[PDB]
RNA sequence: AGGGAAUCUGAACGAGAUUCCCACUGUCCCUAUCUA
RNA sequence: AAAGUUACCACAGGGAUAACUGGCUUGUGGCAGUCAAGCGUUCAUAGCGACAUUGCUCGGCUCUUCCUAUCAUACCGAAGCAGAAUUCGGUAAGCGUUGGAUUGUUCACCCACUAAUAGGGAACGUGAGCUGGGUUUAGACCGUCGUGAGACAGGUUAGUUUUACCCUACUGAU
RNA sequence: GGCAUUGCCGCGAAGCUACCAUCCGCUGGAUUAUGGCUGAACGCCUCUAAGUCAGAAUCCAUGCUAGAACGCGGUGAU
């Protein structure tokens, strides 16, 4: 069998890797910035709840 | 690599004295079958 | 050989030594296990089968046609509680295998009792000999 | 598959485009490669390197030589024989441990004067050197004259051995 | 040894000493032997030998 | 065993066998003694290598001895087949030899093992070690002439065809270059040359083909002016249970006189008498009936340049080979087309949908948007079936609205009673 | 009111011995836990 | 009359040493001849002579670490290597190297599974991690009775390193 | 309920636990054999001599574990 550390199979997973692979993690990373940016205008408002 | 084992240069006391030992014999022996 | 498909692991109930019951119309009506085709190595460990393994079994109790020959025996009851992926952990009343050649093609032209859903699933023609899938 | 399936297909499809170029070039090569060798081959690999190469000389030299001369036109540890009578011989041999396997019954002779050599049976140990109890004993040391069975078939019936067979296998003869 | 016992005169079992004693041998003897004219076919084939006797 | 015999073992060439088997022993036992250990341990040092280099050379010895076909003991048409291309006398001196061979090295390492237990030193040990495999080395060189004949012959045995002496065949004659090699080409798919000289092919041919649902087998032929090419093409005649198809070309062409195929035919007649002979054509018509003379003999005319009357030869061939209430169809399957796998224009299935979706393994096949549902805006199915403790599909029926208002009725005609106080 | 059947040994035996057949068990696969 | 001889030599006595890696060890035998680079004190006819070649022929249970001389797994080269399967060879020690019946002296082997069930070291590795079967009432000295041939339950004797609430490695902890 | 050298029996939480249960166990450079490029030595050639690309389960890193109690750092507290 070939090994963790084969390095053809290394090759292969870096032609999946410039794919599919990467782009997906690369739309859920903006999704979840997304979601940090909204959680500073939840608590902004928060501020403003005091600051009336 | 897995760098294999490397021979030793240090000549102990018994190799080097037997080395002698061993020079020696082969004089004996040169010293007779020059007669022949 | 024959399996269809990939083969997923359940638990190990008949080891080496296990005498199980035939249930193909055959002739024999029970199985001794000699050996397990296609199975793990440890130190000390006994090789063990589990439903719908290929083993290697002798009939003990049954027709001397059948005997004198070890042949290969598929299991289709296994009685030691293994898990599905539909929730429930479950087993049956008995061991119980049946037996055919190495291509899998079964010799008996019918089975008795229920058949294990998995070993149904990885052995087409077991299915065709079934009359009691689960 | 059918008898010469690469043949016909070199015959109709060719060898490859660099085929002339990448064997040329390797044989070019090999000039260097075999130097390139000779300074690396480390241990054992490199004796029977040294081996070869010296006898892919030899045959060479007499390639040009043949070529240019054609231009002008206690238990005894030793190797022992035992006589046919050997049940109930030894009077005066009380426990002089002789093995089966170190007996050895047919003697591989030369003969000098005619360079053929006949594997015969040896009847007699005449005349062991180093010790008269050997001569007894029927030991094969080297210098033992003994006497060779001519069944098979001018001969002469004795032969002086030559080999230590404690050390190889058989007992090697010489006739005189 | 009852297909033995129908078809000889006297079975007798031994394993005599100088054998293995872990081993699971038996030396049977059959002295005498009847020499039939009418010989039982269904009987010395072994089909029909070893059907086990039924469940109690 | 069976037809052919591409499974041998390779042959050494007797230098290289050595090289081999001698190395094997050098790096596959231990190496290393000192002088100064028990006598016991150097004992069974050289005995364990003695013993190694045996079971070595016998090895290889029965490999060649097993592998290779036993010649008299296979069948008639392939003893006498093997015994055409090669020298049969000397086909069973070189497995002789190899059989001599083998039972020497026992006989050797036997002998010095025997004569290595009574050893005295590290020397006389070493010496009997190197006589005992020196020896056996002597023995496999003296093997360098059989065994370079032994590989040659695993070769070309290795790509010899694989004839079936009980399957209905069909021997393929004439002389040397009349056009029979342009009858299997265009029967069959077999790369056979039409090459402008006499003997062009050089072995037995063979062409599968079927027909009337059976498996038929062609065999094309050299051809028959002897030679082992040539006596290779006889014996195959006489051997096989088969009909011969002796051709001939009524042209300028062959350069050979049609009399001398009239000769020849006759002269080979008796071995092919057997056989039901059939004849084709490719004072003088006369002698096209003193072939004719013969008692099983056919004539047949036909061109190669067309595929029709080539087919009718094998037709007629063939035909002495076998001698010697009311179903429901929906319209909708009655009116739809054949598929055309080389069509530009045609329906896509799944296999080309998960090609252009990519991949076999990666694509998801969506269950929905394949079933049939009153509105398609509902066609990604959500399908709660469980709701607290009880699941859905047990609850649910048609109906249900009609049902529980029953209930509903058996609500009040139970509130005013006074259950619930 | 633990079996059973043979055999070796001095027909049942005797805690004689061996072998087999049937049953049983953590001896083991493969250990896990509790108490003193 | 008895005498010569003894390495045919059998028993008692006196001498002389045995048994120290002086880099050990591995794969290709030996004897005789055929060649034959040279050297022989000149030099082939003072002789030695390599590779070839030709003659017939004490065992086993369990763990740790190491070696490569690698059985499998990884990548290669050669091979009539159509494909599959395989044979030889190279780099390679990263990681693997199974389960049962086996006791006339096992210094044998059976029958499967497995990708494969590779070979060795840790000089008395692993008998003060241990058992399974062998000496005969087994060491040494002295005596008594004895033709060549052995006994005597004579008589005197020796058989100390094993425990360390040492030492320190190793694990873990202040 | 006292008590039974835990008198005995059934079930059994918590805890502990089993391939008798379940989950998880990686990706970059440098190379070896080898295959090559340009190219000398040597007015051909030549994978190597100066250079140079690829290439093993190999190596070194990444990752994974401890943290030097006499290695260091930054920060809070008067």
């Known amino acids: 069998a070939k090994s963790l550390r084969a390095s053809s199979h290394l090759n292969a997973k870096s032609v999946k890797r410039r794919g599919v692979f990467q782009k997906a993690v690369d739309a859920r990373e903006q999704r979840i910035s997304d979601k940090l940016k909204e959680d500073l205008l939840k608590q902004k408002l928060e501020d403003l709840k005091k600051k009336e | 690599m897995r760098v294999r084992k490397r021979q030793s240069r240090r000549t102990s006391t018994k190799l080097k004295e037997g080395i002698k030992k061993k020079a020696s014999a082969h004089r004996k022996k040169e010293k007779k079958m020059a007669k022949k | 050989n024959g399996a269809q498909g990939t083969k997923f692991r359940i638990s190990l109930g008949l080891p080496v030594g296990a005498i199980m019951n035939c249930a193909d119309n055959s002739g024999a009506r029970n199985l001794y296990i000699i050996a397990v085709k296609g199975s793990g190595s440890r130190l000390n460990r006994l090789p063990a089968a589990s439903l719908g393994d290929m083993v290697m079994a002798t009939v003990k109790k049954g027709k001397p046609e059948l005997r004198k020959k070890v042949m290969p025996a598929i299991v289709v009851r296994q009685a030691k509680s293994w898990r599905r992926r539909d929730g429930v952990f479950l087993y049956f009343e008995d061991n119980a295998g049946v037996i055919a050649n190495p291509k899998g093609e079964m010799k008996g032209s019918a089975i008795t009792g229920p058949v294990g859903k998995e070993c149904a699933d990885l052995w087409p023609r077991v299915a065709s000999n079934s009359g009691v899938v689960v | 598959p059918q008898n010469d399936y690469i043949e016909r297909h070199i015959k109709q499809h060719g060898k490859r485009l660099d085929h002339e170029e990448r064997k040329r070039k390797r044989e070019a090569r090999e000039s260097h490669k075999i130097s390139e060798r000779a300074q690396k081959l480390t241990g054992w690999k490199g004796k029977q390197f040294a081996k070869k190469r010296y006898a892919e000389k030899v045959s060479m030299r007499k390639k040009i030589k043949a070529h240019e001369q054609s231009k002008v036109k206690r238990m005894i540890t030793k190797h022992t024989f035992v006589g046919e009578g050997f049940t109930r011989r030894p009077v005066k041999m009380e426990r002089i441990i002789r093995p089966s396997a170190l007996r050895q019954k047919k003697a591989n002779v030369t003969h000098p004067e005619l360079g053929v050599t006949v594997f015969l049976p040896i009847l007699a140990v005449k005349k062991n050197p180093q010790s008269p109890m050997y001569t007894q004993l029927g030991v094969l040391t080297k210098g033992t004259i003994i006497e060779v069975n001519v069944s098979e078939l001018v001969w002469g019936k004795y032969a002086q051995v030559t080999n230590e067979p404690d050390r190889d296998g058989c007992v090697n003869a010489v006739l005189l | ?56 | 065993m069976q037809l052919s015999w591409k499974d041998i073992p390779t042959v050494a060439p007797a230098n290289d066998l050595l090289d081999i088997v001698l190395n094997r022993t050098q790096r596959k036992t231990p190496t290393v003694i000192r002088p100064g250990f028990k006598i016991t341990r150097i004992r069974a040092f050289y005995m364990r290598k003695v013993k190694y280099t045996g079971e070595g050379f016998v090895e290889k010895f029965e490999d060649i001895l097993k592998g290779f076909p036993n010649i008299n003991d296979v069948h008639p048409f392939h003893r006498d087949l093997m015994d055409t291309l090669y020298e049969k006398n000397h086909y069973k001196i070189s497995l002789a030899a190899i059989s001599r061979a083998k039972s020497l090295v026992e006989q050797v390492a036997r002998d010095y093992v025997r004569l290595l237990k009574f050893g005295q030193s590290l020397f006389q040990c070493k010496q009997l070690k190197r006589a005992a495999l020196g020896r056996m080395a002597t023995i496999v060189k003296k093997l360098r002439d059989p065994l370079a004949y032994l590989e040659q012959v695993r070769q070309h045995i290795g790509r010899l065809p694989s004839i079936d002496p009980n399957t209905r065949t069909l021997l393929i004659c004439g002389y040397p270059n009349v056009g029979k090699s342009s009858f299997l080409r265009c029967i069959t798919k077999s790369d056979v040359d039409v090459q402008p000289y006499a003997f062009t092919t050089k072995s037995l041919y063979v062409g599968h083909f079927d027909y009337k649902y059976l498996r038929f087998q062609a065999i094309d032929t050299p051809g028959i002016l002897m030679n082992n090419i040539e006596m290779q093409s006889i014996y195959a005649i006489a051997h096989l249970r088969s009909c011969v198809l002796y051709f001939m070309d009524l042209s300028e062409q062959c350069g050979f006189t049609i009399e001398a195929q009239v000769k020849l035919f006759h002269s080979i007649k008796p071995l092919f008498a057997n056989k039901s002979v059939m004849v084709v054509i490719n004072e003088r018509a006369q002698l096209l009936e003193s072939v004719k003379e013969v008692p099983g003999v056919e004539i047949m005319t036909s061109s190669c340049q067309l595929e029709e009357n080539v087919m009718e030869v094998r037709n007629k061939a063939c035909e002495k080979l076998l001698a010697s209430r009311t179903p429901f169809i929906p319209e909708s399957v009655k009116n739809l087309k054949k598929y055309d796998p080389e069509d530009p224009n045609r329906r896509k299935l799944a296999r080309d949908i998960e090609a252009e979706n990519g991949g076999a393994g990666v694509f998801n096949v969506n269950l929905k948007d394949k079933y049939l549902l009153e509105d398609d805006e509902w066609k990604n199915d959500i399908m709660p079936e469980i709701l607290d403790g009880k699941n859905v599909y047990d609850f649910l029926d048609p109906e249900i609205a009609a049902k529980l208002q029953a209930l509903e009725e058996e609500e009040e005609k139970l509130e005013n009673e006074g259950f619930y106080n």
């Open chain 5, 1 to 56: 040894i009852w297909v033995f016992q129908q078809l000889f005169e006297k079975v007798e079992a031994t394993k005599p000493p100088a054998s293995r004693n872990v081993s699971a041998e038996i030396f049977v003897v059959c002295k005498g032997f009847k020499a039939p004219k009418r010989l039982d076919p269904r009987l010395l084939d072994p089909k029909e030998v070893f059907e086990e006797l039924p469940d109690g």
